[PDB]
């Protein structure tokens, strides 16, 4: 259970993990944020979207980082 002190330290360590009660909302929103961080990181899906819509890389990443805030609806209750 000191293992648990370390393990909810691990929950505090890695944003996106889970535990047996985790809610569909936390799960899917964390995966959605991660999806955004990687669309930004990988230099080429950025071209994919930039080219799919008719936007430009500054436009693209600005949208993405705005969306990063409430990507999957408002919260659960």
């Amino acid at each position: 259970y000191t293992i648990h002190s370390q393990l909810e330290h691990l929950q505090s360590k890695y944003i996106g993990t889970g535990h047996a009660d985790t809610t569909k909302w936390e799960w899917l929103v964390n995966q959605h944020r991660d999806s955004y961080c990687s669309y930004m990181g990988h230099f080429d899906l950025l071209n994919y979207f930039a080219i799919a819509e008719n936007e430009s890389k500054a436009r693209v990443r600005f949208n993405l980082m705005e969306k990063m805030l409430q990507p999957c609806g408002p919260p659960a209750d």
Binding site: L10, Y14, G16, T17, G18, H19, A20, D21, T22, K24, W25, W27, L28, Q31, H32, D34, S35, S38, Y39, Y48, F49, I51, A52, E53, P71, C72, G73, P74
Partner: protein
């Protein structure tokens, strides 16, 4: 240089993963761990799939050594077989009625997530959007 004897050895590990004892399955699991980390990248993934089929049932276990060697086998097998295959093994029991099974699957998925959280972005399922949330990812299905 295990890419040679992996075939010779599989039917003996499947033999000893169908029960013989706790220690029998603890040890066959350790063997799977090290085979997987050796054969990383040489294409012998069908054999490690076959042995996943036999190791994964031991997931519900209690003895510390046994469940621990099992978890080790699944990290090794994660690098060697890829994280799709193991996210698919871990899909259905994330949201299960029970709590023993919910907890083991969230333990695994945590370790699958920490290491290689960035592949999974192309491995997550398609999870439909109900009324007041948006859950589909339209980013990924722009055509071009």
């Amino acid at each position: 240089m295990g890419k040679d004897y992996i075939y010779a050895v599989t039917p003996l590990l499947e033999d000893a993963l169908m029960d013989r004892d706790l220690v029998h399955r603890q040890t066959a699991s350790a063997v799977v761990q090290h085979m997987s980390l050796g054969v990383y990248g040489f294409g012998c993934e069908d054999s490690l799939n076959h042995l996943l089929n036999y190791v994964w049932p031991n997931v519900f276990e209690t003895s510390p050594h046994v469940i621990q060697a099992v978890m080790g086998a699944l990290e090794g097998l994660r690098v060697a077989i890829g994280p799709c295959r193991m996210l698919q093994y871990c899909l259905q029991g994330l949201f299960h009625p029970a709590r023993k099974v919910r907890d083991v699957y969230w333990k695994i998925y945590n370790s699958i997530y920490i290491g290689s959280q960035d592949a999974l972005i192309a491995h997550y399922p398609r999870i439909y959007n109900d009324d007041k949330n948006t859950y589909i990812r339209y980013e990924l299905d722009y055509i071009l």
